[PDB]
Structure 1
Amino acid sequence: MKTPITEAIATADNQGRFLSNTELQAVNGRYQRATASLTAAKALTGSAQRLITGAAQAVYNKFPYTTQMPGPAYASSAIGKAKCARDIGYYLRMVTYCLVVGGTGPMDEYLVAGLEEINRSFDLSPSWYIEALQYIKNSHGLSGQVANEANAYIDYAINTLS
């Protein structure tokens, strides 16, 4: 788990160093943006069921074959649509964990590592999840620097699927 605090510890531990004024501004700058990032995590938490089901329908409008084609990898059934809504809820949960810790720690560990082994095995396309995340990027309805923190960790997830 990389945080700003568990990264400046690690460069202090590389040099045998007591925590100098170099490593006391890397952890101070997390505190001047933990205000704006924890309101964005609180806002995305409350509007989760609007954003999950709205993005699951915006996938199905762009890619209509996924609701039509038979076989278990598609959203053409009841349980096929339930597992797609589970997956965007897994994706949106790791965005809010990154706004708590201030970096891409929890989606590196719990989401990204080992993801391409799944998407090739179970025949799931990585462009089904760009369209789900590009909905959430410009339909969360945030503004200012609260939107700047949520839009940083959303397109980190787009770049590890692209």
Structure 2
Amino acid sequence: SRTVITEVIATADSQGRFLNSTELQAAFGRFERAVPAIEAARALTKNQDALVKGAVQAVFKKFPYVTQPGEKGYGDSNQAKCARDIGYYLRFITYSLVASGTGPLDDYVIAGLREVNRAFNLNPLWYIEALNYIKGETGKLLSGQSKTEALLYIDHAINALS
């Protein structure tokens, strides 16, 4: 996936050359930022269930018209799939935090996102609201830099959805 180290190696390889000062300094930055990013992922993993339940509830509060009979938000299967989707997004956000790159998101979620959402008539706004929630509670869950990395990745997901 597209991370700092993998981009470094891909650029070095595409030009057929070794790793020089620039590439090693980039990798050094990755290895320093690993600490805030990894423990932000730890904090996000710990509070995953509450975050997912709250994101689903926020979707329903903003979109009450999905849950009454006849459309996407109705039924135990649909709501379970909603929980599954928000958990997917959170999982890949934590993956991206650990890997220090949007490679997990870009490769697993964002690639093909619009075609899939169009085919199944899933509104991207639902997931935008869920991720905005996730952002709200990661603001209070996380402090200092960890908050910063988690916000960068959550917002990359949001931007891709919008």
TM-score using structure 1 length: 0.95
- Equivalent position amino acid for 2:11 in 1: T
Instruction: Give the Cα–Cα distance (whole angstroms) in 2 for the partners of residues 90 and 153 of structure 1.
Output: 14
SS state of the match for residue 159, structure 1?
Answer: helix
CA distance in 2, matches of 1:16, 1:75: 52
Structure 1 stretches of 4+ moved >6 Å: none
Does 2:22 align with 1:16?
A: no
Letter in 1 for 2:98: V
Amino acid at match of 1:111: V
Shift of 1:32: 1.0
Q: CA deviation at 1:16?
A: 2.3
* Gap runs ≥5 in structure 1: none
Q: Is structure 2 residue 91 aligned with structure 1 residue 84?
A: no
Deviation at 1:79, TM superposition (A): 1.2
Distance in 2, Cα, partners of 1:146 & 1:78 = 35
Quote the offset at 1:69 in angstroms: 4.2
Query: Per-residue CA shift, 1:15-36, capped at 9, x if unaligned?
Result: 2222111111010000110000
Match of 1:130 in 2: 128
Distance between the aligned counterparts of 2:65 and 2:157, measured in 1?
24
Q: RMSD over aligned Cα, in angstroms?
A: 1.0
Cα displacement string for residues 37-84 of structure 1 (whole angstroms, at most 9, x for unaligned residues): 00000000010000000110011011100111414xx12211111111
Deviation at 1:115, TM superposition (A): 1.2
**TM-score, length of structure 2 as denominator length:** 0.95
Q: 1:78 is aligned with what amino acid? A: D
Distance in 2, Cα, partners of 1:60 & 1:42: 27
Distance 2:15 2:112 in 1: 32
Q: Does 1:6 align with 2:6?
A: yes
Unmatched runs of 5 consecutive residues or more in structure 2: none
Identity %: 59
Aligned residue identity for 1:110:
Y
Instruction: Report the AA paired with residue 21 of structure 1.
Output: S
Q: Following the alignment from structure 2 to structure 1, what is the Cα–Cα distance between the partners of residues 125 and 15?
A: 43
- Any residues of structure 2 matched to 1:98-117 within 5 Å, and which? 98-117=96-115
Larger % of helix: which? 2
Question: For residue 76 of structure 1, what is the amino acid of its counterpart?
Answer: Y
